[PDB]
Inverse folding.
């Protein structure tokens, strides 16, 4: 395995289990709006749930940059404080 | 999930897939010698496979202490260099 796959595996289950997400549409490349059709409120709560999964606090400036599962996985894997 | 479980999951598969290990006996608490019947030569090769799974070079001072799956997971999870 790998650390990047470890991160992706947990982001996938956070996003699939979110109530406003149709899990059958989720891929490792899913964009939150352009692929999963989420609105602005859904994105904020999904990103927060991703934060809780990794026991991480992301400042709002970069939390707003997270708009897809690749963005979330790329960011979380690079964060050393991740858990 | 969790970071410690991510490490544990990959250590379990390294140990289970080792040729001198009976995979059916491996748990998160397996001791290499008293539970899996490995000798010191086997343990070194298991430690090396753990080094390659996580792209870590474990100094001999810390490799000698690794005698069980808890020993390996506690060490790897705490090491900031990891993959």
């Amino acid at each position: 395995g790998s650390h990047m796959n470890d991160v992706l595996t947990r982001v996938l289950e956070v996003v699939k289990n979110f109530e406003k997400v149709d899990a059958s549409k989720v891929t490792p490349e899913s964009h939150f709006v352009k692929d999963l059709g989420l609105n602005a409120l859904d994105v904020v709560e999904v990103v927060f749930a991703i934060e809780q999964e990794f026991i991480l606090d992301i400042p709002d400036h970069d939390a707003e940059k997270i708009q897809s599962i690749p963005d979330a996985v790329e960011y979380i894997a690079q964060n050393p404080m991740a858990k």
The radius of gyration of chain B is 12 Å. Residues 1-83 of chain B form one domain. Chain B touches chain A at residues 1-3, 6, 9-10, 13, 53, 80, 82-83 (CB under 8 Å). The CA atoms of residues 60 and 76 of chain B lie 14 Å apart.
